From a paper:
Both FlgEcc32 and FlgEcj79 contain completely different extra domains that are not present in FlgE from Salmonella enterica.
We crystallized a 79 kDa fragment of FlgEcj. This fragment, called FlgEcj79, lacked the N-terminal 90 residues and the C-terminal 37 residues. D1, D2, and D3 are each made from two discontinuous segments. Domain D4 is made from one continuous polypeptide segment. Domain D2 consists entirely of β-strands organized like a rugby ball. The core of domain D3, which consists of segments Ile440-Ser448, Asn496-Val518 and Gln533-Gln617, has a set of eight β-strands separated into two groups by two α-helices.
Author numbering: 94 to 819
The structure:
């Protein structure tokens, strides 16, 4: 019942030629395929050409013919398109995936036993799980693109970072073991003197940049107590983070920094410098008067038994490494001389600072695997092989410093944490690096569940020959317990902001990790991810689903972002038969501009081989948008979501007769069993110059005259016409 108030006169015909006109629209399909009216007149229009599925309205109008039992063969996909958003912002909810797992060996896949760069975006490695799952592994990710378990962006910025303490910083003064002065020992003494009730000593030291001075020290407990006023900061004065306690005989001090307090350099580790004008706890000559029962004190001496000359020799009793009495103990000493310096720096904590710029932490020999250690010509010569040279540097003290550790990716940070736990901590508080400080079985990895994980297996290790300077044979090194303290990084000027979200990730490391089977893990790390299943059809019209996943790898502040695009097909189908990597998996990229528009994506086409009977090498075009536009893939600050997908392929199908209808454009719409809807025919609409000059012949039929003018045939919706209802 196709009617038209607007626009005039359908054409109608019986046999060839001889057309007629009617505004009556009571139309149906017969059992023989002809579109007719009740009078059996076949409506005139244009038929679809199935060879190109086009309707040519330019051709001469003829009988509209629609085979009722018409079968349309399946058509294979030549193109698939997607409309979707990839969240570029800081809230991704559950549209995420875990951080990729990482080896304990930098630049090396331990399972394949090959050299692979974890930070290279050109390299992508898969592994097969126990549940027969093919996952990406061994991939370092820009730390700027990290999320927590909640889907909240850590929003890490260049210059931000954290402190990681691996153990407590400790130092004991007076390691030379000179006894403390004893007022109850009624004889001359040359000892460590901390003052009496009647004699004061001068405390003069610099501790973590803070000068600690007191000339009113009358006991070691006074010194300890005064020093500990500097442990915590005041609103006007820095703290040291260093607590002091007197040793067993009260001859010296035991310092400890757990590095759990503060966010600045001055609150971490122990850097002690003693002034040469310090007298507190130094060497004094105590002379006894038997008559008066009193003591007198001097710290200079005269070069005579009981009052020997005291030569500090540019050192302090606190920090000296050697002490020498002259003459030898069989005779009373007339001179005592110290050897060493005035400072001691104990390092157990390091700062890890993020850089959005490229970072190469470099290769280093690792017993865990990879390249072998390659020594130089001798045990006193640095290696030329890069990883070996860096290993040489490490085991000779090259990491025991306060240098900034710069990282960009998760692999960078992982390996840096591992290297510092192994060679960057003064475990015995000596102020120097030795093989005793080597904790080489510490391993830092990232699990498949996205956690940083640290192990401390109770196993000895080996340092190869010619690695430690002057040591030409192998060295067995022992494991050490570790105690973690994690804080945010800042400066005293307050010009670097702290990142609580990022710091909280690694504060999960906090606590002791004793040698054994225990494992310290970080909080879970996530990535912005979005997956979609794109439907296609093979030559036989079977439906296949392209598994497409986008994971954001990096972002720039006003330069857009970049995603890894992974396409999977279930076996035995193939999309990567001739390329490297698995044959059912394609690895590509999708890059976006700062406005969220598509910049580029690759690949643009795939070569599909279903291997189910259908034809192979089915080239399928990927239509994910054009560069610079928002028509396909976009990455903007809103939830990752699929708007729609489409393909030009379809399975085989048949025409359902009773589902026929007509649009306002005169198109006869045929619905099929395959879900497709085609315009199988377009109804011709024709008008005349005059409408008042026409004759009623049949039932609402009109024939042309000389008064009407000849018939001009056109298409509804063009000119000033159109059709209605169904």
């Amino acid at each position: 019942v196709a009617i038209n108030g607007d626009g005039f006169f359908m054409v109608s015909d019986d046999g060839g030629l001889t057309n007629y006109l009617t505004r009556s629209g009571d139309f149906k399909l017969d059992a023989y395929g002809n579109f007719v009216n009740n009078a059996g007149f076949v409506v005139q229009g244009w038929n679809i050409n199935w060879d190109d599925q086009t309707i040519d309205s330019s051709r001469t109008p003829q009988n509209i013919f629609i085979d009722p039992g018409m079968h349309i063969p399946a058509a294979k996909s030549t193109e698939v398109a997607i409309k979707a958003n990839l969240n570029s912002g800081l809230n991704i909810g559950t549209s995420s995936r875990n951080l990729y797992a990482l080896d304990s060996v930098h630049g090396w896949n331990t399972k394949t036993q090959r050299a692979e760069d974890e930070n290279d975006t050109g390299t992508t490695q898969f592994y097969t799980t126990s549940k027969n799952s093919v996952e990406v592994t061994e991939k370092g990710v820009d730390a700027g693109s990290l999320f927590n378990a909640k889907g909240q962006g850590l929003n890490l910025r260049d210059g931000q970072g954290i402190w990681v303490s691996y153990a407590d910083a400790t130092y004991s003064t007076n390691k030379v073991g000179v006894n403390a002065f004893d007022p109850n020992l009624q004889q001359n003494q040359t000892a460590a003197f901390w003052g009496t009730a009647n004699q004061k000593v001068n405390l003069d030291i610099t501790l973590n940049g803070v000068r600690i001075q007191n000339a009113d020290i009358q006991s070691i407990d006074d010194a300890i107590a005064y020093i500990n006023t500097f442990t915590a900061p005041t609103d006007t004065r820095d703290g040291t983070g260093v607590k002091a306690v007197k040793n067993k005989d009260g001859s010296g001090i035991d310092f400890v920094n757990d590095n759990a307090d503060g966010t600045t350099d001055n609150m971490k580790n122990i850097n002690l410098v003693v002034a040469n004008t310090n007298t507190a706890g130094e060497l004094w000559n105590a002379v006894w008067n038997n008559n008066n029962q009193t003591f007198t004190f001097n710290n200079n001496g005269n070069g005579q038994a009981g009052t020997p000359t005291i030569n500090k020799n540019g050192s302090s009793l606190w920090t000296a490494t050697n002490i020498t009495f002259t003459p030898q103990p069989p005779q009373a000493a007339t001179n005592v001389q110290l050897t060493g310096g005035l400072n001691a720096q104990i390092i157990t904590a390091h700062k890890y600072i993020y850089s959005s710029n490229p970072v190469d932490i470099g290769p280093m020999y690792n017993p865990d695997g990879g390249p072998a250690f390659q020594p130089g010509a001798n045990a006193t010569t640095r290696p030329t092989e890069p990883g070996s040279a860096a290993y040489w540097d490490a085991v000779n003290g090259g990491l025991l410093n306060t240098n900034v550790r710069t990282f960009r990716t998760t692999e960078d940070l992982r390996e840096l944490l591992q290297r510092d736990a192994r060679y960057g901590v003064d475990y015995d508080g000596s102020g120097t690096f030795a093989a005793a400080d080597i904790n080489q079985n510490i391993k830092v990895v990232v699990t498949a569940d996205g956690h940083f994980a640290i192990s401390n297996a109770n196993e000895q290790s080996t340092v190869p020959p010619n690695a430690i300077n002057g040591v030409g044979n192998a060295t067995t090194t022992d494991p050490k317990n570790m105690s973690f303290n994690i804080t945010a990084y800042s400066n005293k000027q307050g010009t670097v902001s702290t990142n609580d979200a990022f710091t909280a990730i690694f504060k999960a490391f906090d606590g002791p990790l004793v040698i054994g089977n225990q494992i310290k893990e970080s909080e879970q790390l996530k990535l912005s991810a979005f997956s979609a299943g794109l439907e296609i059809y093979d030559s036989l019209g079977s439906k296949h689903t392209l598994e497409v996943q986008f994971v954001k790898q990096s972002t720039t502040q006003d330069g857009g972002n970049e995603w890894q695009m992974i396409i999977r097909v279930p076996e035995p189908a193939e999309i990567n038969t001739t390329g490297e990597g698995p044959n059912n998996i394609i690895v590509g990229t999708a890059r976006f501009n700062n406005d969220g528009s598509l910049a580029s994506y690759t690949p643009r086409t795939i070569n599909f081989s279903p291997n189910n009977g259908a034809a192979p090498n089915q080239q399928i075009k990927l239509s994910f948008g054009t560069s610079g536009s928002n028509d396909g893939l976009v990455s903007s600050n809103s939830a990752s979501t699929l708007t729609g997908q489409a393909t030009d392929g379809y399975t085989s199908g048949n025409l359902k007769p009773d589902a026929i209808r007509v649009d306002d454009k005169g198109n006869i719409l045929g619905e099929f069993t395959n879900g497709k809807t085609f315009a199988v025919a377009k109804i011709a609409m024709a008008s005349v110059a005059n409408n008042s000059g026409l004759e009623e012949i049949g039932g609402n039929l009109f024939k042309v005259t000389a008064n009407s003018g000849n018939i001009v045939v056109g298409e509804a919706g063009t000119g000033g016409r159109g059709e209605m209802k169904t």
